[PDB]
């Protein structure tokens, strides 16, 4: 049983969406994915009643759209021609800045931080040492931003690129907030062990931004996930150690002005030292008002607003997947 509402984009002004139920049957189960568009062609019935007794006016019969065919509006892997076609691009020497230049068409410059994004989502060796300890096989990225920088367009592209990635904000909020806890479920009344986003994003890349507006309860969890790659929980009647091997790309925010003084980053930002000890790469965005960036930037701005060498993204998103496998 799937309920269905009207599309939020093409609403006439002043009114509201409304709902209507849709019953599925045998073959059409488990095709849709919630929150996305759909296309149905079904018959239109009305359910009968319970028992008709002395109630008030008026007799009212609900309606049911029984479905018969469901389409999308109106899953990536390789075959053999792409593993033999795979090899010809592999032998070139200018593949690297070809990969950098294919990343972000919107941002004109900033080749260094884009290099750090590529090496971030491209991965590394995990790896075990016989027989005690593993070191780390993930690259964590800190990106000291500035209001007036397209860092949300970079990481918002990285949400589009990778295999398994969860964009999880800190506070405000959206599900979930980095902390695994046993809570009920308002659809289905049984208690559920609901893992956090660091639980949810194993062998992937999580996306966290605006560190300066977070609790200590979250900060102990971020410190936990970079410490020994294991979140353990103990409330209420449950005692586990879930495993979590994430890779965090951050997006910071300076204190007040864009770059407060000559003082270094641990003095400039309002964070702490043990969360700065674990982050590997450190990106800084720039700069003060300069001529050629005003020209090449503003011409691209009006070039973008008037409208009323790379590989296209499908071959690279297959490429890094088969590469990381």
């Amino acid at each position: 049983r799937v309920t269905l509402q009207e599309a939020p984009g093409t609403v006439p002004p002043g009114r509201l969406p409304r709902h209507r139920e849709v019953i599925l049957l045998a073959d059409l189960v488990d095709v849709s994915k919630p929150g996305e568009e759909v296309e149905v062609t079904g018959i239109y019935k009305n359910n009968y009643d319970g028992n008709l007794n002395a109630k008030n006016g008026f007799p009212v019969f609900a309606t049911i759209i029984e479905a018969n065919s469901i389409k999308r509006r109106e899953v990536f892997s390789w075959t053999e021609e792409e593993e033999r076609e795979f090899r010809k691009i592999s032998r070139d020497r200018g593949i690297i800045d070809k990969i950098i230049s294919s990343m972000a068409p919107s941002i004109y410059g900033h080749r260094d931080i884009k290099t750090a994004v590529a090496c971030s989502l491209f991965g590394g060796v995990p790896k075990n040492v016989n027989g005690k300890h593993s070191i780390r096989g993930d690259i964590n990225v800190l990106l000291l931003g500035d209001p007036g920088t397209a860092k949300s367009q970079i990481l918002k592209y990285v949400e589009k690129t990778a295999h398994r990635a969860v964009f999880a904000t800190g506070q405000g909020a959206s599900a979930v907030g980095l902390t695994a806890s046993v809570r009920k479920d308002p659809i289905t009344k049984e208690w559920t062990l609901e893992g956090g986003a660091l639980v949810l994003a194993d062998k992937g890349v999580c996306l966290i931004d605006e560190f300066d507006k977070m609790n200590d309860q979250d900060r102990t969890s971020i410190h936990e996930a970079m410490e020994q790659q294991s979140i353990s929980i103990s409330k209420a009647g449950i005692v586990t150690t879930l495993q979590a091997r994430c890779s965090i790309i951050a997006a910071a925010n300076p204190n007040g002005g864009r770059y407060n003084s000559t003082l270094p980053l641990a003095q400039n930002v309002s964070l702490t030292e043990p969360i700065l000890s674990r982050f590997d790469i450190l990106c800084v965005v720039r700069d003060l008002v300069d001529e050629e960036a005003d020209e090449r930037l503003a011409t691209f701005v009006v070039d973008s607003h008037v409208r009323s060498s790379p590989i296209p993204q499908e071959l690279l998103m297959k490429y890094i997947h088969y590469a990381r496998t």
Partner: protein
Amino acid sequence: VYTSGKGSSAAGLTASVQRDPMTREFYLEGGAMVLADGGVVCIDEFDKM
């Protein structure tokens, strides 16, 4: 038991007591010291607690 806290992660560090919402009943919740009875507890950041 390895707790780097401040309490970690959704588990506190000492013997807290939480009443069961059903039955309105007391039970030992847990922590770090009580689970590790008869051994070694390791702590990071002992000053920053």
